[PDB]
Amino acid sequence: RKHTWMEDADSCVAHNALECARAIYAYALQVFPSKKSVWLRAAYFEKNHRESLEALLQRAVAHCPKAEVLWLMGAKSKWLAGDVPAARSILALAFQANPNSEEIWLAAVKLESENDEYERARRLLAKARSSAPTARVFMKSVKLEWVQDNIRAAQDLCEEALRHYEDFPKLWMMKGQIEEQKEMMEKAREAYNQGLKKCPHSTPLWLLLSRLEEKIGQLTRARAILEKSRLKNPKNPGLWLESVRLEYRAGLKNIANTLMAKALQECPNSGILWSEAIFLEARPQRRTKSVDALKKCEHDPHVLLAVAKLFWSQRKITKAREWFHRTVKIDSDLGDAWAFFYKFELQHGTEEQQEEVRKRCESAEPRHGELWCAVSKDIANWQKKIGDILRLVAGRI
Amino acid sequence: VNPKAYPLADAHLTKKLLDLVQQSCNYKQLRKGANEATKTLNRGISEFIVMAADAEPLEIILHLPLLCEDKNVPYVFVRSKQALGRACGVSRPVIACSVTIKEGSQLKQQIQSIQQSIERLLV
Amino acid sequence: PEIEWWDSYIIFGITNLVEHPAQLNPPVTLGVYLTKKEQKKLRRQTRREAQKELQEKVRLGLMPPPEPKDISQGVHISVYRVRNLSNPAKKFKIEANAGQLYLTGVVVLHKDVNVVVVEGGPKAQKKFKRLMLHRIKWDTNKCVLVWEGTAKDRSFGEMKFKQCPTENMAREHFKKHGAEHYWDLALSESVLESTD
Amino acid sequence: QTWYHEGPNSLKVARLWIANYSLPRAMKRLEEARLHKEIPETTRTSQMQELHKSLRSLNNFCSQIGDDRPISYCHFSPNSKMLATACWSGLCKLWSVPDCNLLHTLRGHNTNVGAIVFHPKSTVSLDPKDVNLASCAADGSVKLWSLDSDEPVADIEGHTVRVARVMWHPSGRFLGTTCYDRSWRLWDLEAQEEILHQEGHSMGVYDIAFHQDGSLAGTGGLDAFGRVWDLRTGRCIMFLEGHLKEIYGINFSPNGYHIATGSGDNTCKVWDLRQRRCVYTIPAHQNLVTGVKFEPIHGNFLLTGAYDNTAKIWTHPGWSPLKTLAGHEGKVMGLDISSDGQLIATCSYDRTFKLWMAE
Numbered sequence A: 001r002k003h004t005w006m007e008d009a010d011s012c013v014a015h016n017a018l019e020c021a022r023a024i025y026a027y028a029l030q031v032f033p034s035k036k037s038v039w040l041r042a043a044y045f046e047k048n049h050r051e052s053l054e055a056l057l058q059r060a061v062a063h064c065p066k067a068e069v070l071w072l073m074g075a076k077s078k079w080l081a082g083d084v085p086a087a088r089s090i091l092a093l094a095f096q097a098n099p100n101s102e103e104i105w106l107a108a109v110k111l112e113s114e115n116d117e118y119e120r121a122r123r124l125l126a127k128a129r130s131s132a133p134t135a136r137v138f139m140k141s142v143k144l145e146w147v148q149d150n151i152r153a154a155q156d157l158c159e160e161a162l163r164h165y166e167d168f169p170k171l172w173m174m175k176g177q178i179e180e181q182k183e184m185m186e187k188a189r190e191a192y193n194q195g196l197k198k199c200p201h202s203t204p205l206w207l208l209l210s211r212l213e214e215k216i217g218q219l220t221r222a223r224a225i226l227e228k229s230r231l232k233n234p235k236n237p238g239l240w241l242e243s244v245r246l247e248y249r250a251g252l253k254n255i256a257n258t259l260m261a262k263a264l265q266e267c268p269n270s271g272i273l274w275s276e277a278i279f280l281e282a283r284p285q286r287r288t289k290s291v292d293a294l295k296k297c298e299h300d301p302h303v304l305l306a307v308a309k310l311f312w313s314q315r316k317i318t319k320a321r322e323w324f325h326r327t328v329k330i331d332s333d334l335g336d337a338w339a340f341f342y343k344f345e346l347q348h349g350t351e352e353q354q355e356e357v358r359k360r361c362e363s364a365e366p367r368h369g370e371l372w373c374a375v376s377k378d379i380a381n382w383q384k385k386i387g388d389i390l391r392l393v394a395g396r397i
Numbered sequence B: 001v002n003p004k005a006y007p008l009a010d011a012h013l014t015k016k017l018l019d020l021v022q023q024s025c026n027y028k029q030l031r032k033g034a035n036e037a038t039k040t041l042n043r044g045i046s047e048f049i050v051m052a053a054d055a056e057p058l059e060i061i062l063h064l065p066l067l068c069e070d071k072n073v074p075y076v077f078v079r080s081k082q083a084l085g086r087a088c089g090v091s092r093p094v095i096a097c098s099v100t101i102k103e104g105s106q107l108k109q110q111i112q113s114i115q116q117s118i119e120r121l122l123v
Numbered sequence C: 001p002e003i004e005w006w007d008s009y010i011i012f013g014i015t016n017l018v019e020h021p022a023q024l025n026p027p028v029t030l031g032v033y034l035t036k037k038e039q040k041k042l043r044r045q046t047r048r049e050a051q052k053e054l055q056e057k058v059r060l061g062l063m064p065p066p067e068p069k070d071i072s073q074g075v076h077i078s079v080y081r082v083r084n085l086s087n088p089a090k091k092f093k094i095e096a097n098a099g100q101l102y103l104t105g106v107v108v109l110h111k112d113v114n115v116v117v118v119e120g121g122p123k124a125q126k127k128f129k130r131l132m133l134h135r136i137k138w139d140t141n142k143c144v145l146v147w148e149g150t151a152k153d154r155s156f157g158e159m160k161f162k163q164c165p166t167e168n169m170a171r172e173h174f175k176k177h178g179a180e181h182y183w184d185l186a187l188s189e190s191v192l193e194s195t196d
Numbered sequence D: 001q002t003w004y005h006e007g008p009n010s011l012k013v014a015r016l017w018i019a020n021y022s023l024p025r026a027m028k029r030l031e032e033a034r035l036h037k038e039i040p041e042t043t044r045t046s047q048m049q050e051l052h053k054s055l056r057s058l059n060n061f062c063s064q065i066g067d068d069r070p071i072s073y074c075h076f077s078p079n080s081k082m083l084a085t086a087c088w089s090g091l092c093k094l095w096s097v098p099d100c101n102l103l104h105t106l107r108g109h110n111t112n113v114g115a116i117v118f119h120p121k122s123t124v125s126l127d128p129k130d131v132n133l134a135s136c137a138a139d140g141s142v143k144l145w146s147l148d149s150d151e152p153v154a155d156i157e158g159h160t161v162r163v164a165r166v167m168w169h170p171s172g173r174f175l176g177t178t179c180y181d182r183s184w185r186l187w188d189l190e191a192q193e194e195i196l197h198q199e200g201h202s203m204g205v206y207d208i209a210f211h212q213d214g215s216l217a218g219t220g221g222l223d224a225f226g227r228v229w230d231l232r233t234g235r236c237i238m239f240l241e242g243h244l245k246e247i248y249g250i251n252f253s254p255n256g257y258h259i260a261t262g263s264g265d266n267t268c269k270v271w272d273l274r275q276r277r278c279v280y281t282i283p284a285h286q287n288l289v290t291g292v293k294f295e296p297i298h299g300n301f302l303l304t305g306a307y308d309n310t311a312k313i314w315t316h317p318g319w320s321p322l323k324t325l326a327g328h329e330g331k332v333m334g335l336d337i338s339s340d341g342q343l344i345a346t347c348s349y350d351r352t353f354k355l356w357m358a359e
Helices: A002-015 A019-031 A036-048 A051-063 A068-082 A084-097 A104-114 A118-131 A135-148 A152-164 A169-180 A186-198 A203-215 A219-232 A237-249 A253-266 A271-280 A286-296 A301-313 A317-330 A335-347 A351-363 A372-376 A386-395 B011-026 B034-043 B063-071 B108-118 C005-010 C036-059 C088-100 C122-135 C167-176 C180-195 D009-037 D041-056
Strands: B030-032 B046-052 B075-078 B097-100 C017-019 C075-082 C105-109 C114-120 C143-151 D004-006 D058-064 D071-076 D083-087 D094-096 D133-136 D142-145 D165-168 D174-178 D184-188 D194-198 D216-218 D226-230 D234-240 D247-252 D259-263 D267-271 D278-282 D301-305 D311-315 D335-337 D344-347 D353-358
Touching: A002 A019, A002 A036, A019 A036, A019 A051, A036 A051, A036 A068, A051 A068, A068 A084, A068 A104, A084 A104, A104 A118, A104 A135, A118 A135, A135 A152, A135 A169, A152 A169, A152 A186, A169 A186, A169 A203, A186 A203, A203 A219, A203 A237, A219 A237, A219 D058, A237 A253, A237 A271, A253 A271, A253 B063, A271 A286, A271 A301, A286 A301, A301 A317, A301 A335, A317 A335, A335 A351, A335 A372, A335 A386, A351 A386, A372 A386, B011 B030, B011 B075, B011 B097, B011 B108, B030 B034, B034 B046, B034 B063, B034 B097, B046 B063, B046 B108, B063 B075, B108 C122, C005 D009, C005 D226, C005 D234, C017 D194, C017 D234, C075 C122, C075 C180, C088 C105, C088 C114, C088 C122, C105 C167, C114 C122, C114 C143, C114 C180, C122 C143, C143 C180, C167 C180, C180 D278, D009 D194, D041 D058, D041 D311, D071 D344, D083 D344, D083 D353, D133 D165, D194 D234, D216 D247, D234 D259, D247 D301, D259 D301, D267 D301, D301 D335, D301 D344
Parallel strands: B046 B075, D071 D335
Antiparallel strands: B030 B097, B046 B097, C017 D004, C075 C114, C075 C143, C105 C114, D058 D353, D071 D083, D083 D094, D133 D142, D165 D174, D174 D184, D184 D194, D216 D226, D226 D234, D247 D259, D259 D267, D267 D278, D301 D311, D335 D344, D344 D353
């Protein structure tokens, strides 16, 4: 009966209005105490439809104990709306009720690193490493030590995380990114090779190894590393897309077309490979390539972003805006599609379309994108907002 | 035969290729003609591309292995189009009979076997 | 060794004698496609000819009509490695597969190393590979194909489920039929899979 | 029914010169084998374990693309100078190994190039302006080429069939060429003409290579019979049989007994010469084994390629899969190890050529 009341409240929230749905959610919350799923659903309904969301977060913190997700949502709602030190005090109060340093300590370290006084963030990261050490906490400590400066302590923490979490490729990728920011580049390539040979299946570590072997000259070794990464998975779509991009970056256009054809024959249900085949095709041949990508990979965000880019390149702003709206309705969490939509709104359209694109990028955070991950993984734009990252992704297109 | 036509199949290999081409054309999976084979190679849906060594001139099918080098497809050159002289009802011998993948083909694996057999002749 | 055979034969045996030794051979009726218009013409002509022949045969006055109403020249030999093919259903199916598909061969079992060698025609070996790779569901116990080549003739007589607790007995049983190198390569591949 | 035919006096003089150059070479090889047999088993086992550890950690690197045509063969220059590759186009480039830099691409062919194998003393004791490499095309042509001229030389018109492979003699004065006219030609570098045409097979020979001392020369083609003909007066008594497919790869071991033959029956035959039998049949791969390369003068391994995307670096002898040099994207056609043994190139059908280096 409580599940049916929650489904009726969700259907009332999505169908007509939000007052009766919030009343049904409050009746289901006051009738009987439920688990963290109903509290998270009530918090999402309060955030999607300031004071009411904070009251629901306080009610979930007071009536539903051992709820780290609801406490993190309340701390994020306090830091977004109310105050940053009030959210820090709320996170410190929630850390006194939940002694686990898995997600509360990382959220406290992120809240202390987004604000000033990074020594408190380093002390919280050291306390989280001394209380419950993990690969994610060590990676967050290495990121907090490397976002300020490329000191030897950050390299020592990355080496300790690579020695203690060698099966995890994230510590080796962080060590390679820390060594790549220094003067030398052979140490970063050696760390990326150790992470690729110790995982043994590491797609972003092999991608960073191929990028370091291609950007530092002698791209034949980069092509050999890309072939070894494609044969070690085997037949990874990301490694095939990276090899196609490395072949298209040079003067070998026929080899890049053959690599794109081999990636389409070995993995036809890939949005990134379909977008690369649509971008690498000719201008009168893009209408058949986009149709084949829509027929093979339907309802894909990367294929819709490639169709939006092809419509914007063909001087069709009304079709590119509709394709960007369809890509935002299919997957609003995409970074490259949101960047292409913001670039199309800034290039063709008034400020209302750019404001709507900024509101869509601020409501749902873009992640796992092509241009978003290039700016979200750097140390210079690690503690930045979502709107500035979206503007930097749209301006770099 | 023509020296530029490569690779050249044997008698039983050409008989199996003609049987596979007849099974594909009777099940609506094969396209005859040079322009249709070029369109099937450019579309990326052609499983195999067969040529004819007895073509005057033989340079007109010379882009048929090269497109096979652009889409990673096996290429083969029947000694004479006469092998497919009737082909799929074609009165004249057929040369470019792009055999395209057929969904749930009653001989899909057999066609794959022909491909595997056409990749070892070019050495 | 003191010297080679050619060095002992030549050392004086150099001369201008060009010969062609060992002239031996290495170890047809075919149809073509038809035409659709020719197919329709043939169907019409055949129906007309059948009707005319029936009329001639039953109307001349002889019978009243009714009222009008290859292991040779190359054999495919495959060898697969399984971690635990001891399963009676799996072991018997592989042995029976070889038996029914005429895949003369052997199924040797050892300590976490099961070598199933089949030998026969190309379609029989393809059906056995499709049965052992997609139809026979083993599961840590997995079955993979170690090698697949072509030979002159079949080595084993029939599919016999051999058994050997040690690898030396299985190697001697494979060398009795002349297939010890395939079992050694399968054992080396199993050791490389267990080490890595 | 081995019918004999008389030859010219220049062929007999070249055979006598080859015998007089191979007999002290065979004596030095026998002395080296007696010195290696006098070594204890502990140091030999330690050297074999070190060679196996160096070959097992062989990573593929410097995969430099030659051209848009797939690579058909590759031959390492002597003294680890470069690597001459022969693709499916008319160009035969020479990439500087291990730098993977193409320089002085010897062109001049029209059809698909076959095996462009350099001389064993080209970068050692031959001038770079003279003939140093020998290339062959899909038509009848055995063209000499220099290393710093990028222009061919006056070829031998004695072959009118598809010359599959060509390999120079270790003495340097001769060069064998396997043609499709059911024979194998033996051109001379000093006489500048074809010395003999050994028809030891009923079908056209594919791979022809001489021995380490230059006394014998192994053949093989579509006749499924490997012929080991002596350079003195022919009379191939060491006939290799057992392979039911076409022999597309011949590689003579530095030892006087072992001889590696690669056929399309997914196996490699390491046969003995002192017993005239097949010592081992190693299943190196499952595809058609076309490329095969023997060891350097240490004599410990054998790199056998195939039509798959891998190449097996097995031990010699032993026939064990010690190393699987994978990483290619096409049929591995043509492979050759350097004179030092630390580098080995394996040309593939993916229009790229890498090198296996010890990590």
